[PDB]
Design a protein around this ligand. Structure first.
Ligand SMILES: N[C@@H](CCC(=O)N[C@@H](CSSC[C@H](NC(=O)CC[C@H](N)C(=O)O)C(=O)NCC(=O)O)C(=O)NCC(=O)O)C(=O)O
Ligand SMILES: N[C@@H](CCC(=O)N[C@@H](CSSC[C@H](NC(=O)CC[C@H](N)C(=O)O)C(=O)NCC(=O)O)C(=O)NCC(=O)O)C(=O)O
Lengths: 204, 204
């Protein structure tokens, strides 16, 4: 049993995707981010960076006490290692997978997040910053599409944690002033993953 | 032999640190970022996201053709896996290490980078954005210090790729309008890693 500390967000949805895909037992423990749930001391012990997602794995493979982890990327990696699923053990495909996973974590998510912030959250309008993060979103979707033109999935021939990590951010394209049709390979990969049974399950 | 595609930056320095620490043969292939080196087509084949660092590993453990990787985090992980060094194989320490590695890649580096951008690069002064990234830098150094108060290294008792990934960003504190003395645990960890022989070697 995995407890997932969760708010309905792209980053939270990365973990429900994986959990449904891997067929792992879990429950959702809602964290209320508008009401400062993420600063509750006993959450900060689970997740010191004050963010969701975080998990508590009640059955760690060493059979010890529960294990807490934060950071969507490290949760996906830890769960891919634990299950043997959605991350290859072959050196080249594994490396390519990890590369795009770190790419999503360092680039896609931080930059689209700044985009969501300046366009849908900031008190006052900051044209330099809106332009700066809009151009970067486009570059990021161009990088994403470039790869998906050459490979069916980001790591090679198999669906992996790299695709799982990006999908919920692409799925918020409507909030990013992105026309998904400008990136046909992204558009197809997006619909392909939308129609996977586990994604369906996570979206209920 | 590892070729490292490199510019003198925090992100580039993560890889020289590791390489010196692991005692791996490598050469530096300078990429000129002010002159658009990162858009040269044969670099973009190595590193499609148009960034350094990237490596070409000429002796991959499978004995195949050279293997290219981009993203500092995936390079460190790939090299830690390949060498068996600076990332634990014990489940809990490994997970804690990876957590802080992803934390650096998703938070520390993107946010300090935005900080360096608005304070030392942007054409015009954007007070909302300068304030936004300055507060976030402080929060990030507070998270970093909080951890280093409770553990000697970010992953547990051993120096690891989590520390290697953060160190060059902390080492640019003078560019961030950060008083390192406000974060004593960070200050000590910083000097401790400055004085390691391999860091010394990488700084020549
Ligand atoms: N690197 C972490 C990021 C986790 C994260 O961003 N969590 C958010 C909710 S996801 S929803 C997306 C999230 N935005 C936000 O959290 C909005 C509030 C924020 N402080 C702001 O002003 O931008 C974002 O932009 N993320 C960028 C990224 O994924 O790298 C959170 O718990 N926030 C609590 C808080 O901020 O107090 C991961 O992958 O787990
Ligand atoms: N996530 C990647 C980031 C790699 C990266 O940022 N590389 C930089 C040089 S490191 S030096 C630090 C880097 N800044 C820059 O590259 C400055 C130029 C930039 N386009 C801007 O306007 O901010 C930065 O802020 N990084 C944030 C982070 O680490 O997440 C690069 O090659 N830039 C070429 C280009 O931009 O065309 C990784 O970990 O490898």
């Amino acid at each position: 049993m995995i407890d997932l500390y969760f708010a309905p967000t792209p980053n939270g949805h990365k973990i429900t995707l994986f959990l449904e895909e891997a067929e792992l037992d879990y429950r959702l423990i809602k964290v209320d981010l508008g009401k400062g749930g993420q600063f509750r001391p006993e959450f900060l012990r689970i997740s010191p960076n004050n963010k969701i997602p975080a998990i508590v794995d009640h059955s760690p493979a060493d059979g010890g006490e529960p294990l807490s982890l934060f950071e969507s990327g490290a949760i996906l990696l830890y769960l891919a290692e634990k299950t043997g699923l959605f991350l290859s053990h072959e050196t080249r495909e594994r490396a390519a997978t990890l590369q795009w996973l770190f790419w999503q974590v360092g680039g896609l998510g931080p930059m689209l997040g700044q985009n969501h912030h300046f366009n849908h959250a900031a008190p006052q309008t900051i044209p330099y910053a809106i332009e700066r993060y809009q151009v970067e979103t486009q570059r990021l979707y161009h990088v994403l599409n470039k790869r998906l033109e050459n490979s069916p999935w980001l790591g090679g021939e198999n669906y992996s944690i790299a695709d799982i990590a990006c999908w919920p951010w692409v799925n918020a394209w409507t909030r990013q002033r992105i026309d998904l049709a400008m990136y046909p390979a992204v558009k197809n990969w997006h619909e392909r993953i939308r129609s996977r049974p586990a994604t369906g399950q996570a979206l209920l």
